[PDB]
Nucleic acid binder design. Structure first.
Ligand SMILES: [Zn+2]
Ligand SMILES: [Zn+2]
Lengths: 115, 114
DNA sequence: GCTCTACTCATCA
DNA sequence: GTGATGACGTAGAG
């Protein structure tokens, strides 16, 4: 019977992380390691990792979970990504965590300059 | 015996202008009146009339004729619009021809002031 | 801490 | 005189 990849103890995996994100990770371990397993909105992915719509809209590149938009079901559905996937992608895109920092620096100098 | 709306004489209408653009206009009169009847590419519509992709892509709004892209059939199809439709939309959007020149004006000042 | 689309230009197609 | 899409962004309206 397969064990959770963090704790190596649990055999009941988080249904979302397992079914949607293909991760053999229990619910308690997901909460204990948000740096790998937290679900991020589309908007959070753009803000946090500077990924673009084309990257995030690409069905081949990321797993994702859709939910009704929490402001209204008539609005476009919310889209949730798993941190470890979007982070891996962004580290490749920008040159590691330091890469991302660099890009953080640059955009804020812009917004400073633009005032 | 239905007649061209420009010349009131010809009965044989330009097949593109009639079939595609719903205009009861002969080929000769289409050539004699490019201010109404010329076909303009999607690119020319953006450059000439400051129409945007959303406007030009809206199938409800304009009639259009597609053709293979002249640079290569593997590229996106060429899209042709008729002047009188594009222009009327643009005049509506920008406030007349003067409106359009004002916007022409505004944009060149950008390229200068950049 | 919601998301899509719309508002100059290059490039590749 | 070819066209779609993607970029330093950001506000609306959904
Ligand atoms: Zn576990
Ligand atoms: Zn005629």
């Amino acid at each position: 019977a397969p064990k959770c990849i963090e704790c190596h103890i649990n055999i009941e995996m988080d249904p979302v992380l397992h079914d949607v994100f293909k991760l053999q990770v229990c619910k308690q371990c997901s909460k204990e390691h948000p740096e790998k397993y937290a679900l991020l909105t589309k908007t959070e992915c753009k803000e946090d990792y500077f990924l673009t719509d084309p990257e995030l809209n690409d069905e081949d590149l990321f797993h994702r979970l859709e939910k009704p938009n929490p402001h209204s079901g008539t609005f476009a559905r919310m889209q949730l990504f798993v941190r470890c996937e979007v982070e891996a992608f962004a580290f490749k895109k920008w040159g590691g965590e330091e890469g991302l920092d660099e890009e953080w620096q640059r955009r804020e100098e812009g917004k400073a300059h633009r005032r």
